[PDB]
Design an enzyme around this catalytic site. Structure first.
Site, PDB file in Angstrom:
ATOM      1  N   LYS A  20     -35.101 -87.832-101.585  1.00 26.05           N
ATOM      2  CA  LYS A  20     -34.317 -88.364-100.483  1.00 26.05           C
ATOM      3  C   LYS A  20     -33.192 -87.422-100.038  1.00 26.05           C
ATOM      4  CE  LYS A  20     -32.347 -92.390-101.266  1.00 26.05           C
ATOM      5  NZ  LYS A  20     -30.909 -91.985-101.235  1.00 26.05           N
ATOM      6  N   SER A  21     -32.401 -86.944-100.992  1.00 32.31           N
ATOM      7  CA  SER A  21     -31.295 -86.030-100.690  1.00 32.31           C
ATOM      8  C   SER A  21     -31.756 -84.759 -99.980  1.00 32.31           C
ATOM      9  CB  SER A  21     -30.566 -85.641-101.975  1.00 32.31           C
ATOM     10  OG  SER A  21     -29.922 -86.759-102.554  1.00 32.31           O
ATOM     11  N   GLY A  92     -26.045 -94.225 -96.484  1.00 30.28           N
ATOM     12  CA  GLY A  92     -24.697 -93.725 -96.658  1.00 30.28           C
ATOM     13  C   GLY A  92     -24.743 -92.210 -96.568  1.00 30.28           C
ATOM     14  N   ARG A 120     -19.132-100.331 -97.065  1.00 29.70           N
ATOM     15  CA  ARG A 120     -18.813 -99.135 -97.839  1.00 29.70           C
ATOM     16  C   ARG A 120     -17.766 -98.232 -97.170  1.00 29.70           C
ATOM     17  NH1 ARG A 120     -24.516 -96.666 -98.901  1.00 29.70           N
ATOM     18  NH2 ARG A 120     -23.475 -95.615-100.661  1.00 29.70           N
ATOM     19  N   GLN A 168     -21.809 -86.138-101.430  1.00 32.83           N
ATOM     20  CA  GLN A 168     -21.791 -86.388 -99.993  1.00 32.83           C
ATOM     21  C   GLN A 168     -20.521 -85.850 -99.352  1.00 32.83           C
ATOM     22  OE1 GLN A 168     -22.426 -90.559 -99.217  1.00 32.83           O
ATOM     23  NE2 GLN A 168     -24.505 -90.588-100.074  1.00 32.83           N
ATOM     24  N   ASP A 312     -27.471 -92.578-109.527  1.00 32.50           N
ATOM     25  CA  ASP A 312     -28.430 -93.503-108.936  1.00 32.50           C
ATOM     26  C   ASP A 312     -29.432 -94.076-109.932  1.00 32.50           C
ATOM     27  OD1 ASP A 312     -27.212 -93.098-106.483  1.00 32.50           O
ATOM     28  OD2 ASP A 312     -28.628 -91.530-105.871  1.00 32.50           O
ATOM     29  N   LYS A 339     -21.710 -98.522-103.911  1.00 35.36           N
ATOM     30  CA  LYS A 339     -23.047 -98.188-103.420  1.00 35.36           C
ATOM     31  C   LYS A 339     -23.624 -99.292-102.513  1.00 35.36           C
ATOM     32  CE  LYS A 339     -23.014 -94.311-105.634  1.00 35.36           C
ATOM     33  NZ  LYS A 339     -22.950 -93.018-104.885  1.00 35.36           N
ATOM     34  N   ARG A 343     -23.217-102.050-107.831  1.00 32.37           N
ATOM     35  CA  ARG A 343     -24.256-101.964-108.845  1.00 32.37           C
ATOM     36  C   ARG A 343     -23.811-102.287-110.260  1.00 32.37           C
ATOM     37  NH1 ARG A 343     -27.806 -96.752-106.700  1.00 32.37           N
ATOM     38  NH2 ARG A 343     -28.953 -97.934-105.097  1.00 32.37           N
ATOM     39  N   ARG A 385     -32.779-100.078-105.046  1.00 32.18           N
ATOM     40  CA  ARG A 385     -32.877 -99.878-106.490  1.00 32.18           C
ATOM     41  C   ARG A 385     -32.778-101.169-107.299  1.00 32.18           C
ATOM     42  NH1 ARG A 385     -32.512 -94.057-105.477  1.00 32.18           N
ATOM     43  NH2 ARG A 385     -34.421 -94.207-106.734  1.00 32.18           N
TER      44      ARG A 385
HETATM   45  O1  LIG Z   1     -25.506 -86.284-101.262  1.00 33.34           O
HETATM   46  C1  LIG Z   1     -26.502 -87.007-101.548  1.00 33.34           C
HETATM   47  O2  LIG Z   1     -27.650 -86.807-101.146  1.00 33.34           O
HETATM   48  C2  LIG Z   1     -26.290 -88.208-102.442  1.00 33.34           C
HETATM   49  C3  LIG Z   1     -25.050 -88.369-103.123  1.00 33.34           C
HETATM   50  C4  LIG Z   1     -24.770 -89.567-104.047  1.00 33.34           C
HETATM   51  O3  LIG Z   1     -23.593 -90.348-103.506  1.00 33.34           O
HETATM   52  P1  LIG Z   1     -21.978 -89.914-103.765  1.00 33.34           P
HETATM   53  O4  LIG Z   1     -21.772 -88.579-103.139  1.00 33.34           O
HETATM   54  O5  LIG Z   1     -21.221 -90.992-103.056  1.00 33.34           O
HETATM   55  O6  LIG Z   1     -21.833 -89.930-105.282  1.00 33.34           O
HETATM   56  C5  LIG Z   1     -26.022 -90.510-104.261  1.00 33.34           C
HETATM   57  O7  LIG Z   1     -25.525 -91.788-104.669  1.00 33.34           O
HETATM   58  C6  LIG Z   1     -26.861 -90.608-102.953  1.00 33.34           C
HETATM   59  O8  LIG Z   1     -28.003 -91.459-103.117  1.00 33.34           O
HETATM   60  C7  LIG Z   1     -27.356 -89.192-102.607  1.00 33.34           C
HETATM   61  O1  LIG Z   2     -30.202 -93.906-103.406  1.00 37.61           O
HETATM   62  C1  LIG Z   2     -29.306 -94.447-104.145  1.00 37.61           C
HETATM   63  O2  LIG Z   2     -29.471 -94.847-105.288  1.00 37.61           O
HETATM   64  C2  LIG Z   2     -27.895 -94.635-103.606  1.00 37.61           C
HETATM   65  N1  LIG Z   2     -27.768 -94.143-102.188  1.00 37.61           N
HETATM   66  C3  LIG Z   2     -26.455 -94.278-101.567  1.00 37.61           C
HETATM   67  P1  LIG Z   2     -26.434 -93.719 -99.902  1.00 37.61           P
HETATM   68  O3  LIG Z   2     -27.440 -92.674 -99.674  1.00 37.61           O
HETATM   69  O4  LIG Z   2     -26.708 -94.914 -98.999  1.00 37.61           O
HETATM   70  O5  LIG Z   2     -25.041 -93.282 -99.777  1.00 37.61           O
END
Ligand SMILES: O=C(O)C1=C[C@@H](OP(=O)(O)O)[C@@H](O)[C@H](O)C1
Ligand SMILES: O=C(O)C[NH2+]CP(=O)(O)O
Length: 427
Positions: A20-21, A92, A120, A168, A312, A339, A343, A385
């Protein structure tokens, strides 16, 4: 929806969907670069789709043809004002990273999200962004969505020390720095997923990483690339756990991203004594096949430095911990409360309604292990999740039923989850 229960065995090969990231970033980098970018095996969960449509709304051409994503880059100063407000949905990652992307937009835009996203805080990103000259505000002092952002052609470089272990916020600031004139320095509080750092380099950009200090010179021009997305470990995590806790099971998860800043669950599984085998390692793509077998686990301590490496995965790990002998402590995880759902509270309530013994705390939870689980009704509250965690938990319910309401939430990151689960029940 009715969840499957009392499974007697799980066997099979699973190729979890894309990370996803990384998928989110492939679209962002693809849009900001000059030239064409092609993304393969991208995650088509709703969150990534929200990101793609946001950029199309910003004038970026993004075609999804025959399983390949093709993006026609617009430069770095090429995004245009959208016709309507930008819909971030449940993502997010989308709203936070894109806030930094639009740091240089010479127009004002609105960004909204669903019921989950709207609760959030965005202050963590608005505060540093305003230091650069960006005008951004939300609801209340925590800047909850919907947000209104107006960028500037006169972006000042950023010098910021993150007060939380967020990838993020780091990434949002990096995208903004790419547009500002001058030297930006971003200091992490703890090492967090370094996907933005890796991909900036892959798209022809440059940065310096000295420990937790990240230096980005601006402005920069990037070049379109061919991006191959690896399997998401966070998605594989559901099967790593299921394979460890379900009886007579052995699962093989292929093509799973193995980036060190994302492998927290692997260390936990080892500490707990789970049977885990890592093979077919691709040192360049940082991927591998993970194999797990039914195991007897012991509790462990999960804290500092490790949290951002499995943030996560804490929901599924909590379930994992419910099956281990003894206590498992999770602390320094206050970030869980902010989140898709709190959670700490939702995970505690969900699993306790199923066999319990989880004590929520201000920064995590304490789980006393080896609980036989039973039936219950769980609502996802729009958190994918929670849904998948409950589905794996349900497999261990010897006698009773489990109803999962709002199960579609799972589509935000793993649309084919139940198809994969079904393929394992027969083998
Ligand atoms: O940068 C990213 O892709 C992510 C950062 C994480 O959040 P935080 O930066 O708020 O820890 C994670 O919870 C999210 O699902 C993916
Ligand atoms: O994927 C996860 O477990 C948490 N994602 C948080 P988001 O991407 O909405 O900030």
């Amino acid at each position: 929806m009715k969840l499957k229960t009392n499974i007697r065995h799980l066997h099979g090969i699973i190729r979890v969907p894309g990370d996803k990231s990384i998928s989110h970033r492939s679209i962002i980098f693809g849009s900001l670069a000059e030239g064409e970018t092609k993304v393969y095996d991208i995650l088509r969960g709703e969150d990534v789709l929200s990101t793609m449509q946001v950029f199309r709304d910003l004038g970026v051409e993004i075609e999804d043809k025959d399983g390949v994503i093709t993006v026609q880059g617009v430069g770095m100063a090429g995004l245009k004002a959208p016709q309507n407000a930008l819909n971030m949905g449940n993502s997010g990652t989308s709203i936070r990273l894109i806030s930094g992307v639009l740091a240089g937009a010479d127009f004002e835009v609105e960004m909204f999200g669903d019921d989950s996203l709207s609760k959030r805080p965005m202050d963590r990103v608005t505060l540093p962004l305003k230091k650069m000259g960006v005008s951004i505000s939300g609801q209340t002092e925590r800047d909850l969505p919907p947000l209104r952002l107006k960028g500037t052609k006169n972006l000042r470089p950023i010098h910021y020390e993150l007060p939380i272990a967020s990838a993020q916020v780091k990434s949002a600031l990096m995208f903004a720095a790419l547009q500002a004139k001058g030297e930006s320095v971003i200091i992490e509080k703890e090492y967090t997923r370094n996907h933005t750092e890796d991909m900036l380099q892959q798209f022809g950009g440059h940065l310096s990483v000295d420990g937790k200090k990240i230096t980005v010179q601006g402005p920069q021009k990037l070049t379109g690339q061919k991006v191959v997305v690896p399997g998401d470990i966070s998605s594989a995590a559901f099967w790593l756990v299921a394979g460890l806790i379900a009886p007579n099971s052995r699962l093989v998860l292929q093509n799973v991203g193995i980036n060190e800043t994302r492998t927290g669950i692997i260390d936990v599984i080892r500490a707990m004594g789970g049977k885990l085998e890592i093979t077919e390692i691709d040192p360049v793509a940082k991927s591998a096949t993970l194999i797990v077998e039914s195991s007897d686990l012991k509790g462990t301590e999960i804290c500092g430095a490790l949290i951002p490496r499995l943030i996560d995965e804490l929901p599924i790990i909590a379930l994992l911990a419910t099956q281990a002998q003894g206590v498992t402590v999770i602390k320094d995880a206050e970030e869980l409360k902010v989140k898709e759902t709190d959670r700490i509270q939702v995970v505690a309530d969900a699993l306790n309604s199923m066999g319990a013994d989880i004590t929520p705390t201000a920064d995590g939870m304490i789980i006393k292990g080896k609980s036989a689980l039973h039936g219950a009704r769980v609502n996802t509250f729009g958190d994918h999740r929670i849904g998948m965690m409950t589905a794996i938990a349900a497999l261990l319910v010897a006698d009773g039923e489990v109803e999962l309401d709002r199960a579609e939430a799972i589509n935000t990151s793993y649309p084919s989850f139940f198809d994969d689960l079904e393929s394992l029940i027969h083998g």
